[PDB]
């Protein structure tokens, strides 16, 4: 099936998902100097105080933390967004070395990892339905650079040994996603897509300017995960990122300057 390898990775996806060569594909290189400040962007509101994490799982492509999105908790609103978007999961993409791993790039810079907090437009009632619509999802993307540790990430890192292989999961309650946010909410925004199959062009990307710092020990724990299931041939879960795609006719806006 699809994956991140030589024979099934990003260059191959368009065969099963022709939208791979579409007009709004993600990620992209963000040129910080041609990003257009947009005064009509409203203040960005990240309201995570009532977030309810449920479970963490290894799906064979990454790991994800699932939230209870059945109520009006953990919402993103404002910025470029119309209406209210509810948090449903977060996940990461990372590299086999610190010099790569992010999907978005900033003036060509690759970060060691990228965090995606995935929200769905409450007009659509759930995340699956939302993903079929052009305005269906908003993804808050945060870069991870290697340096000092992120204490708020440690709960995640410390359970990863329990979900090493595809199809493992564990209960994962009371994880506070506020602990993964940098100080600044300055951001870039552009219209795009899922970065994995089916590559739907349903995402309003919101990419924060300020990375978070994580430690080498934290990122090393990501790299001990496996794409395979237990009892199958070992393949380390590393380099699960799609490279930058053409911007085409789109404009990237900035919330600042
Ligand atoms: N990359 S993304 O663009 O934020 C994203 C979404 F917005 C989403 F709605 C659903 C998605 F599957 C993804 N990508 C995967 C990426 C990693 C392997 C599997 C874990 C789930 C997330
Ligand atoms: Zn992602």
Swiss-Prot record:
Result when mutating residue 89 to P: In OPTB3; in Czechoslovakia
Domain of life: Eukaryota
Keyword line: Acetylation, Cell membrane, Cytoplasm, Disease variant, Lyase, Membrane, Metal-binding, Osteopetrosis, Phosphoprotein, Zinc
Impact noted for substituting residue 195 to A/C/H/P: Strongly reduced activity
Catalytic reactions of this protein: hydrogencarbonate + H(+) = CO2 + H2O; urea = cyanamide + H2O
Primary localization: cytoplasm
Active site, UniProt feature: 61 (proton donor/acceptor)
Molecular function GO labels: arylesterase activity; carbonate dehydratase activity; cyanamide hydratase activity; zinc ion binding
Effect the entry attributes to changing residue 194 to E/H/R: Strongly reduced CO(2) hydrase activity
Localization in the cell: Cytoplasm; Cell membrane
Family: Belongs to the alpha-carbonic anhydrase family.
Biological function: Catalyzes the reversible hydration of carbon dioxide. Can also hydrate cyanamide to urea. Stimulates the chloride-bicarbonate exchange activity of SLC26A6. Essential for bone resorption and osteoclast differentiation. Involved in the regulation of fluid secretion into the anterior chamber of the eye. Contributes to intracellular pH regulation in the duodenal upper villous epithelium during proton-coupled peptide absorption.
Name of the protein this chain belongs to: Carbonic anhydrase 2
């Amino acid at each position: 099936h699809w994956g991140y390898g030589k024979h099934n990775g990003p260059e191959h996806w368009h065969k099963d998902f022709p939208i791979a060569k579409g007009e709004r594909q993600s990620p992209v290189d963000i040129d910080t100097h041609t990003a257009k400040y947009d005064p009509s962007l409203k203040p960005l509101s990240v309201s995570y105080d009532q977030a309810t994490s449920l479970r963490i799982l290894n799906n064979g492509h990454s790991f994800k933390v699932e939230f209870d999105d059945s109520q009006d908790k953990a919402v993103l609103k404002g910025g470029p967004l119309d209406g209210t978007y509810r948090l449903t999961q977060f996940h990461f993409h990372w590299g086999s070395l610190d010099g790569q791993g992010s999907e978005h790039t900033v003036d060509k810079k690759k970060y060691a990892a990228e965090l995606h907090l995935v929200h769905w437009n409450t007009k659509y009632g759930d995340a699956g339905k939302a993903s079929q619509q052009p305005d269906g999802l908003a993804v808050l993307g945060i870069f991870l650079k290697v340096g000092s540790a992120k204490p708020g990430l440690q709960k995640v890192v410390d359970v990863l040994d329990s979900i090493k292989t595809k199809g493992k999961s564990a209960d994962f309650t009371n994880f506070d996603p506020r602990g993964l946010l940098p100080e600044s909410l300055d951001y870039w925004t552009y219209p795009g897509s899922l970065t994995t199959p089916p590559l739907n062009e349903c995402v309003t990307w919101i990419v924060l300017k300020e990375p978070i710092s994580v430690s080498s020990e934290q990122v090393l724990k990501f790299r001990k995960l496996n794409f395979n299931g237990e009892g199958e041939p070992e393949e380390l879960m590393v380099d699960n990122w799609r490279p930058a795609q053409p911007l085409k006719n789109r404009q990237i806006k900035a919330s600042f300057k």
